[PDB]
Amino acid sequence: EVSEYCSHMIGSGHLQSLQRLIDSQMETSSQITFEFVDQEQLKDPVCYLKKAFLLVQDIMEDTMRFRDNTPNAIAIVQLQELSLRLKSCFTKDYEEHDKACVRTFYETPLQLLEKVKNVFNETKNLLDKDWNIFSKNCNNSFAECSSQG
Amino acid sequence: EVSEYCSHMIGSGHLQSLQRLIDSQMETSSQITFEFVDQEQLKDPVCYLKKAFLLVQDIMEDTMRFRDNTPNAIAIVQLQELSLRLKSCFTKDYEEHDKACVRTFYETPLQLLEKVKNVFNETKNLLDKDWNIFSKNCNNSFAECS
């Protein structure tokens, strides 16, 4: 079940952690490649975040990497712990729609980090309005995407 | 004027702060371009650091940029202040030789930060050995560079 366990689960400390993450990065024009949800393909706000929340998990595990026991590595662990708690708040969608709406991006680390912060921030905002919002069936939204990863 | 006060300017807090900078950088394939001293051209330890000390000031001003008032931006300002004090410890070498021993690098921000930390670390170490050491005339060392 999705349940009231979902409401208020993403806290302000989580967002401040994301912000300190962003603020400590040296500013660079250097771009990196990553997979993320293509907003131009998936425009519905709820299903965008349903898909994006899942990808953020891969992004944290493989891309947002820091030295053991540094403040930023600790924030990632907390965001991963938080994401595990959040997994019962997103209803599962069809497995045929796993790579739909995903594309490779060529963007700076700061732009990737802003995408991740926006996912956690907007997920928190919608959960605070309705703890059941991510029980939405997004199979038709994913089917309307033009491409796949 | 070079003086005994040189051996007291770079503190442990400056290095620990540099380490905290390094520890906060995300491990990523993102590489950046910068100008720095070539260790292969300038192998003499003292003249390497005379050259590297000047270049680190451009790197801090133009490349190691952080959003204003963040912990890392403040650390950079403090390292810049510290460098301003250290300039009394380095005698001038011929202007002749400004871009000598310098080449472009394409390395990660972590690698650049390690290069900067090593300059401050080795400078502190040598000043602790002879606070007059960077009065050395490095004009001939700079001349053998490519």
Curated annotation (Swiss-Prot), chain B:
Domain of life: Eukaryota
Glycosylated sites: N121, N139
S-S bonds: C6-C89, C47-C138, C101-C145
Protein name: Macrophage colony-stimulating factor 1 43 kDa subunit
Species per Swiss-Prot/TrEMBL record: Homo sapiens (Human)
Gene: CSF1
Range within the parent protein: 34 to 179 of 554
